[PDB]
Symmetry: C5
């Protein structure tokens, strides 16, 4: 098995589409291996640009096709370069732009911690024909930066493993294990924008739904409650596009449900206060003085639901 | 007829666009057949990468073009590999990303049960020239997983049939039957997000439209009703993008119509209560105590309409 | 002029974008003509797959390029096949996905009746060099089906005509007429979704604007009217994306204008009622009992405007 | 300099994206020039289809590359045809779909008058090597039609000029002037849709903000004013997508600002009326009878701002 | 090292997508270098069009591939031209359309000052093999113009530097420095549209939240406050699409937060006024006369937050 030394330089990461859980990676890949010696004009290495590598591959030069496992379709490969040496070593440099998909878990949407994963693998040659010796990733352009809403922390973790494929077991009996390179970049989401745009007004409206009971009239308090519920409906569609449809509830959705439940609890308390008048002449004092105990109970509810 | 053994490995399914009823499938296809023996350098099989298969096809190697029947346009084929053996067998491996369309029935939108269908067929060679022996599908990557909002249940059902085409009957008199492979993956939609985001507040507003009659003033009750109807209008456009335009009504649309009908019934009951005053001095008691019978009747209506 | 027999098989029609009046057609085309006899290996026809036709065209085989007149740019041609016979006949089969544009008239938006038109023409050879003998269209996949919101009725009408081009008259003096094939598929829109989603609540709000006059207070009736007008504004943007900007008014837009006019007429009637008090002590009876004549007049207005 | 006679046939114009000021043009181009005589099989001209012109260009046939100056990127060229004659004349016919950008001035958005400009130029050969003799444009398909919201008036004006480029002056000392063809098609926007959808309800709400002062209560008049201002906010986002962000104000934006200013003037007049009570017992008559002078002044304001 | 003289002509800049911080640049590039002398037919230079350069590169002509560092994927290169001279100089002209990304800082969103940066670099040849002598940029088409919402000021600054790459240090020990060209075009955003569309109504609503205290009733003042807060919620989604999610607050977002805080301060002041009644018979005068001091304090707050 020929040994290939890979080096990935991550130029930038952007386009983090949290809806489809794909992110765009732009960068360069430098694969390097050693082959049989060849005659090169002069005592200098020979550089072969793009759309000129095809003549060398047609003549019979062994250039492996390294694909990305977790890419969406095909990467938009820009330029490629093949640098050949007289002693036998080959260096294949290429530039890639790819849409990569990783399993993202948005259980804590604003304070999220994800990792961007690049999985690289030979498409044809298995570990008995191609072995990845080492990979070192130079993510120095975005080592400690803020790309769009994500802080990149530290360096990029690298791993080299062997993947056994069962769909190639019927066509290749024993030799179906492929050498795979995994590159993980840990990123934390910047929670500032959601903190001052999607959490603070929701807290203000929750406190307003707390304050609806300070009136002394039933029907005007009801129209107040319904205008508040229309405002919670307004944030229902103001905050719908920022996240996909997940079975669990994040903090934003928990606060939206908290607003709905607070308005419904207010309406039920008003109705029971109207029903509490046994003869229609007795007023309400204790059930109308819940303007301070309901904030305490709802603060306890929020403290449970956030953690 | 040469016998071709196909093996499809579904790497991932995503991008389930319920509006156009297309889904994106990424995976690999391994077709395998047996041809006439050829001389290969050494006692090892020969691997031909992408854009090098074209030289073999120009020299005269028989490589069938397997197309997808239900694909949108053309798949974004990435790498392809042709592995040739001295005893005569040929293995064509390829990677595909495709937008596939299937007839989806959204009569039960949140609790939906669909199936993703891959239909594969030779474009040129009929069943007298190319016969699919068997297909076994390894959907092990997504065998029991949750891709975006869908649970994949069990394995993938496979079927091999013969399709008779009438447009090729005029050009091919008797031999126009094509061997087709059908792969069906049964998926169930995760109904959680719609349950806590699109159903529960609609139930709260339906109960609120029940509770509008607890006031003792006509005009303020009317403005309450109109603010509620504006809120139902707010969910009219808050829930419009999640589903195409279908002749039938799903649960979400049935609840939206239920909210509209409940507000209109409330307005008609208020107006008939105002019309019930024969001399303008008699009040309303029975028609104003419908705050409990109307919930019962509307619960019966909802129990009928959901089932 | 060589005679070409065309056969179009419409696999599916979808993506009917009423805004730009384009629709996506997926299908197959089978052109067939007769040429000079050639020697074929064996006593069987020879099948040439895609990217292998180019060698035959370079060697000198006459394969006409049939283009689509009403296509948006270029179709996404998938596979193509060229089947050659020893007696001389050539059959060119191809698969196309195209965005086609037709002049659509949305004067009756929900109850619309459009036709999808495929116009096919040789790009280079005129009627003195290429003549279309006949076309028969097998739209059996969607003969009587519901694609997205359209019922396809009957079979597909076909026509063969000759088009004289004036831009080629300066370069070709007399021979500039091209044989054209036109295929028309008549489709009717399913009006159910707009009936229970875009028409019924508008009728309910029109009846509500009828019912605004049942109050006995001027200012609360005014705020009722303004909340209703805000609801009509809510349907202004709830129903804006479903149709392009046309000079005429459809039923949905006529009902939106009806709602605006009904609210404005209500406001003017309230203001004239306030102005009708000559001394400020006389009340209003006839102008305040218009809660039944205004529905009759507006029903007559709607009966005129729908038809 | 060889003389080239160009003829552009505009099949259709569509996709007028007023946000980015680009429009899609579909059509055909017929360039014609005269070269050295050549031997052609028979006494008939020879027609060379697409992907067969490349062999003639490789053999040494002079085919100029006419590019579009104001195109977005590259046009989607469909088929191309090269018709060669024995006497020496060459006719290059091609089909183009292009996104073209022109400097559009939306100072009068509904009653706009724009022009669609096609600028054609040789990419390599200057006026000393290639001269455009004449261009005549056959826009007969859309001569007097309504494409999407635009009326096309008259024929297409054509012009042939010489452009001197300063970036090629350093590489070409004196010969850097290129022959350019400019085609201008004057179009007027259909203002009907904006008239009955974006102007009339704004006038109704302006008249409603005029009518807010007919009440006799301060606070209810204030909530009336705030509901009206919320409605003007509703048209703020109902009419935001139809036009880009321009420094100047169009009629729609002037009416939106008129609505905002009318509501603010109403609020200030109410507040000054509340402040006009010196002892709290004197009422307001003149400042409360501004329900007719304010319409006159605002009509004068609108008459100034529209013109 | 061969010396290359580059000249970039910026035809237009458009599509400034502030969300992803990319802008589209259309233009031409003219690289020029001097090579070994060659024999050309006649005493005139030879012009090689697009898809004919490939034959010269296959024969062995040295044409460097200049890539754009900050481009999104690959530019849509249109035509290219290679002009060869008998004395040895080569001129490579090309047209590019590219999506370029630069680090944009939107701390002052309407009054923003950005710079569009074009970074050009050889993909293969380092500074010991390729050196950029000089670049002069002719941005005369957009020297002093308004493209979409940006004024371009002055000329384009140019710089030539050397970049040392650490990912190529392992494969190239000492010679890994690349000659880079940087072109910066300073642009200022036109702040007019945001001034009369996104700032002025926010100021009017802030003044309205100032004016809410002029009433003498608690509950109606509360519903007034809640309708105002619903209007601020309406601008929450009316102004969400114009800018990405940034950790800091711009002027528009600061005014939105100012509106939220003003409504919440109004609600707290009303509640404390209701709580200030010790026995329920004493009224409020000083806390109800804050209709003038609160504007002064909020004007001071706004004067601090804008600067």
């Amino acid at each position: 098995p020929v040994d290939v030394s890979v080096s990935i330089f991550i130029n930038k990461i952007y386009g983090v589409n949290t809806l489809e859980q794909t992110y765009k990676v732009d960068g360069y890949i430098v694969a390097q291996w050693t082959g049989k010696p060849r005659k090169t004009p002069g005592d200098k290495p020979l550089i072969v640009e793009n759309t000129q590598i095809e003549r060398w591959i047609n003549n019979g030069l062994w250039v492996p096709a390294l694909e990305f496992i977790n890419v969406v379709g095909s990467p938009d490969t820009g330029n490629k370069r093949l640098m050949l040496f007289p002693d036998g070593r080959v260096i294949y440099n290429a530039r890639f732009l790819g849409s990569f998909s990783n399993d993202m878990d948005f259980r804590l949407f604003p304070f999220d911690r994800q990792q961007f994963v690049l999985e690289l693998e030979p498409f044809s040659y298995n570990n008995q024909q191609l072995r990845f010796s080492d990979i070192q990733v130079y993510t120095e352009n975005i080592d400690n930066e803020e790309i769009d809403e994500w802080w990149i922390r530290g360096k990029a973790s690298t791993h080299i493993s062997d993947i056994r494929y069962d769909h190639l077991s019927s066509v290749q009996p024993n030799q179906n294990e492929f050498s795979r390179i995994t590159v993980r970049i840990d990123a934390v989401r910047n929670p500032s924008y959601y903190l001052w745009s999607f959490i603070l007004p929701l807290g203000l409206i929750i406190a307003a739904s707390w304050s609806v009971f300070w009136l002394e009239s039933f029907s005007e308090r009801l129209q107040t409650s319904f205008t508040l519920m229309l405002t919670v409906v307004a944030y229902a569609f103001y905050t719908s596009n920022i996240l996909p449809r997940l079975p669990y509830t994040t903090v934003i959705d928990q606060m939206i449900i908290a607003g709905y439940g607070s308005i419904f609890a207010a309406i039920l308390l008003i109705i029971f206060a109207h029903h509490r008048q046994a003869n229609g002449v007795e007023d309400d004092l204790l059930i109308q003085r819940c303007r301070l105990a309901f904030p305490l109970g709802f603060l306890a509810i929020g403290c449970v639901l956030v953690i």
